[PDB]
């Protein structure tokens, strides 16, 4: 009740009334009202990172959020937060940064009190116990154990080779060894450390809150003033440190790191002082816009033209409060690693060429106009994630610009541009090279993660080759942008309008699905395409030239369309199994120009030979490093291969890259674009005549340049799914080569897509959503990766289980069967009211309107590419869902999912590691020693008839 805001800055497109305030204990509180919301939410941000751990015990803040979800004194049940939140269509999650920790949830229509008081007890008074500390560190061990092979090792190696007396050189996760094994090796208690950590830091003023309410902006202000008033200010000042961790002994240095997956990268690290205080001029975003910018005559395009560099991201990377980095991070080609000194020479060539002319007024004016237009039409936000974001930046800004963060800029002061532009000098460089060519050359190794590297401090030869004489190459500044938008007129709703996209064109070449946007009224309209070809996936060779051609098209068109991607017009062009794909979205004004240029660059396409010879190798080293990936990800991929009519392995395509040559690929594009068929939806703010004009220009350009003919309707076909026998127990194991964990995915297949049988599997997969997490991970501690839900491929729906762990996989499959039996025992015991609570939770989870325009375009397109065309399946299906009995779910269970079931279909994939409470009797498994033979002797399901 200290401070109340009158009205703050909001974009005039929004309708959500706001209110900011501050409580008696110095908590920054933000209030969001929404009359038409459907899932309310709230969040919190304690301004304490993992950079305030004590030196003896490492990773208390992460272990503390990880231990805080379980158990309070006003609710002694272990899961009452998670159980009540999952009974009401909600989900809770949290993480720790180096500086702060986010706590956030979302909840159903009006259940604010019964979940806010549960989220509040979180900080009022928490209670832990022996059990939780005993079975929680195993999940934190799996947490570290998934990242011991994760190359995102480079982070801790940047943390390591700095100032070892500095608080930046600290470890965030804990690996069961620093958390558990060290403190009882020397008798240090953990619970006292946790109560001291929490009572010292977390309970103070530091945290800020935000709540996304439905009712009013006065109904809930008196609600949050009586509900978070207990947490008491301990007057803790914010931890900060003016001394940057990089002292001059470890500057001007060039390490050499060895990865696990075959990559080649070059990191150029500069230290700069703090520029978070200057959030109005933002010099770092200016230099990020001028250094890391692809296009005509810029830093990237010359290194492309010399064959050294694939891509390079510039910008300024944040750090702690006292210091801040500046990075130009590059990737490398095969012969890019020979010329690193010349690469960084060109980088200082472009720096000095941007230092000779310095500041520019019109680049600032352009960027400020672009951020103002990008702020004025900010699309709608999902209420979970958004309040965590706007609680996550609430510590820095006053009440008026809580929203207008990195969108509005007031002044262009070139003096700070010159300050940050002088700190980029080759006496401030720290080069870091990552290459798998350093197998036997590394002296030093990391203890925490186990990576190997060197110390080659650069002698002054190459320093006084960098800064000696720097006139120019052929660089220039970027020119005037032409994809900036000017037409912002919402076209009036057509007299004939449809709530669902309607077939408007139907020819043997194409078909359309069109809807003018009725809900959102934003001057932007996405549009996407699905081209079909029977020659795109015929054999590995024809499934492999497709990615090479398509990729080189994106390569040769980035130079053109990066200004469109910077102005607000984004495209995406990738391949699919059946044919290729296209999706162009963004502001409504410059869609034609872009789509047209994409088509005429698609059909009339030549091949630059050195670019092809680079991309071929950059794909050959992107196939064969699939073996260095998760065991359970191998398991999901393995199931797809054995459960589809045709699929080719990752060993086939890298075998058939020993045949792709320039003339072969060069004759392939006239074979792919000779006969084809187009399917598309157009969505957003467009008239119907302009929709027919869009498809007209598209198919007329393909007619004009490609000599495209329509396909016969008998060769518009899909793939089918193998039908398992009425009684089945299929399994075959493979061995992950580089990960020390095991993994498993087991598949229970029911049936085809019906309107009376999707609610059986969906309700049974909602009745086991919370218990499966609690029994497998919270209790039995089978690992960190627990997931169980409906899988739908080729229409045929099945319920699966994804779980990967240290344990041997058949132990997992037995304890899954035990969970099934215990689950049906808990189902037959449950009362009517909890069953109607689960039905209401699924009737709220599924009957939920999308907020963003792409969130309904991905609702329409994702079913139009499945050839079912059922747009009203969100209403009628859930109108059938309301009339179900507990007995009907038990019927679904007995003959389909049970162990004694007559109609029981089950296939299993075991991925095991490098060196590998009453379970029931299980039938002897049948081993699949050959994938093709297994598919041959089995029938295939029929395809789904359209609506």
């Amino acid at each position: 009740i200290k401070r109340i805001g009158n009205h703050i800055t909001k974009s005039p497109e929004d309708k959500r009334e706001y209110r900011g305030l501050e409580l008696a204990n110095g908590i920054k509180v933000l209030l969001i009202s929404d009359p038409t919301t459907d899932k309310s939410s709230a969040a919190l941000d304690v301004h304490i990172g993992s950079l305030s751990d004590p030196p003896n015990i490492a990773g208390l803040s992460h272990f503390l959020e990880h231990m805080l979800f379980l158990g309070t004194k006003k609710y002694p049940k272990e899961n009452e937060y998670s159980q009540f939140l999952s009974e009401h269509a909600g989900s809770s999650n949290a993480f720790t940064s180096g500086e702060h920790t986010n706590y956030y949830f979302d909840v159903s229509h009006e259940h604010l009190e019964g979940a806010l008081d549960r989220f509040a007890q979180f900080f009022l008074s928490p209670l832990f116990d022996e059990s939780a500390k005993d079975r929680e560190v195993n999940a934190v061990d799996s947490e570290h154990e998934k990242n011991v092979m994760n190359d995102a090792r480079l982070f801790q190696l940047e943390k390591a080779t700095g100032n070892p007396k500095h608080p930046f050189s600290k470890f965030g996760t804990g690996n069961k060894y620093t958390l558990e094994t060290r403190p009882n090796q020397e008798g240090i208690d953990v619970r006292q450390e946790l109560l001291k950590f929490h009572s010292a830091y977390y309970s103070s003023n530091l945290m800020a809150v935000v709540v996304l309410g439905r009712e009013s902006l006065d109904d809930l202000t008196n609600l949050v003033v009586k509900l978070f008033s207990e947490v008491e200010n301990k007057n803790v000042p914010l931890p900060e440190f003016p001394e940057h961790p990089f002292q001059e002994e470890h500057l001007k240095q060039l390490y050499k790191i060895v990865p696990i997956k075959d990559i080649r990268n070059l990191y150029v690290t500069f230290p700069i002082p703090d520029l978070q205080k200057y959030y109005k001029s933002n010099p770092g975003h200016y230099l990020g816009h001028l250094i890391g910018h692809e296009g005509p005559g810029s830093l990237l395009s010359e290194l492309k033209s010399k064959g050294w560099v694939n891509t390079l991201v510039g910008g300024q990377k944040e750090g702690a409060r006292g210091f801040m980095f500046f990075i130009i991070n590059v990737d490398l080609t095969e012969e890019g690693l020979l010329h690193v000194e010349d690469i960084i020479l060109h980088m200082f060539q472009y720096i000095q060429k941007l230092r000779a002319e310095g500041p520019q007024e019109w680049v600032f004016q352009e960027l400020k106009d672009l951020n103002a237009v990008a702020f004025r039409f900010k699309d709608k936000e999902r209420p979970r994630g958004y309040t965590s974001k706007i609680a996550g930046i609430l510590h820095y800004y006053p009440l008026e610009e809580v929203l207008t963060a990195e969108y509005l800029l007031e002044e262009f002061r070139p003096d700070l541009i010159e300050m940050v532009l002088d700190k980029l000098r080759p006496e401030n460089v720290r080069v870091a090279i990552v290459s798998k060519s350093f197998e036997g050359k590394t002296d030093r190794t990391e203890e925490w993660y186990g990576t190997q590297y060197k110390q080659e401090a650069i002698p002054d030869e190459v320093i006084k080759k960098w800064q000696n004489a720097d006139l120019n190459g052929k660089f220039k500044l970027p020119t005037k942008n032409e994809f900036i938008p000017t037409n912002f007129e919402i076209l009036p709703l057509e007299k004939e309008a449809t709530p669902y996209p309607a077939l408007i064109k139907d020819t043997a070449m194409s078909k359309l699905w069109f809807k003018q946007d009725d809900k959102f009224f934003l001057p932007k309209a996405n549009l996407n395409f699905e081209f079909f070809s029977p020659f795109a996936y015929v054999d590995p060779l024809h499934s492999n030239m497709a990615y090479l051609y398509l990729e080189l098209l994106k390569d040769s068109l980035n130079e053109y369309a990066y200004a469109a991607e910077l102005a607000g017009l984004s495209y995406d062009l990738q391949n699919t199994i059946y044919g290729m794909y296209l999706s162009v979205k963004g502001y409504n004004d410059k869609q034609p120009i872009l789509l047209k240029k994409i088509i005429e660059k698609m059909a009339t396409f030549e091949i630059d030979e050195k670019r092809f010879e680079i991309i071929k190798e950059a794909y050959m080293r992107s196939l064969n490093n699939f073996r260095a990936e998760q065991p359970h990800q191998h398991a999901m991929y393995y199931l797809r291969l054995l459960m589809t009519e045709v699929a080719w392995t990752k060993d086939e395509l890298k075998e058939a890259l020993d045949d792709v040559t320039l003339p072969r690929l060069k004759a392939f594009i006239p074979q792919l674009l000779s006969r084809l068929h187009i399917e598309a939806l157009l969505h957003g703010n467009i008239t119907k005549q302009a929709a027919l004009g869009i498809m007209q220009m598209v198919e007329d350009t393909l007619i004009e340049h490609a000599h495209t003919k329509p396909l016969l309707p008998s060769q518009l076909v899909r793939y089918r799914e193998v039908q398992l026998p009425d009684r089945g127990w299929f399994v075959y194991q493979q061995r992950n080569e580089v990960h020390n964990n095991s993994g498993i995915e087991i598949y229970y297949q029911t049936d085809m897509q019906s309107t009376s049988e999707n609610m059986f599997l969906e309700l049974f997969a909602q009745i086991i959503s919370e218990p499966a997490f609690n029994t497998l991970r919270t209790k039995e501690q089978l690992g960190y990766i627990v997931f169980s839900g409906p899988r739908r491929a080729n229409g045929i729906q099945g319920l699966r289980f994804i779980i990967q762990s240290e344990k041997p996989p058949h132990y997992l499959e037995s304890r899954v069967e035990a969970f099934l039996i215990t689950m049906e025992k808990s189902i037959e015991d449950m009362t009517e009211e909890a069953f109607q609570k689960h039905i209401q939770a699924l009737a709220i989870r599924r009957l939920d309107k999308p907020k963003k325009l792409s969130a309904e375009s991905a609702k329409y397109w994702g079913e139009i590419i499945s050839q079912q065309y059922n747009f009203d399946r969100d209403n009628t299906e859930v109108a059938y869902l309301k009339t179900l009995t507990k007995e009907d779910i038990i019927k679904f269970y007995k003959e389909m999912l049970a162990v004694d079931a007559p109609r029981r279909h089950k296939v299993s994939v075991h991925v095991l590691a490098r060196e590998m409470s009453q379970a029931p009797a299980l039938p002897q498994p049948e081993v699949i020693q050959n994938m093709t033979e297994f598919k041959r002797g089995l029938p295939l399901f029929p395809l789904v008839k359209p609506h």
Binding site: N93, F95, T173
Partner: peptide, 8 residues
């Protein structure tokens, strides 16, 4: 980036 319950 140390999320709880992973994702998906």
């Amino acid at each position: 980036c140390s999320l709880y319950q992973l994702e998906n």
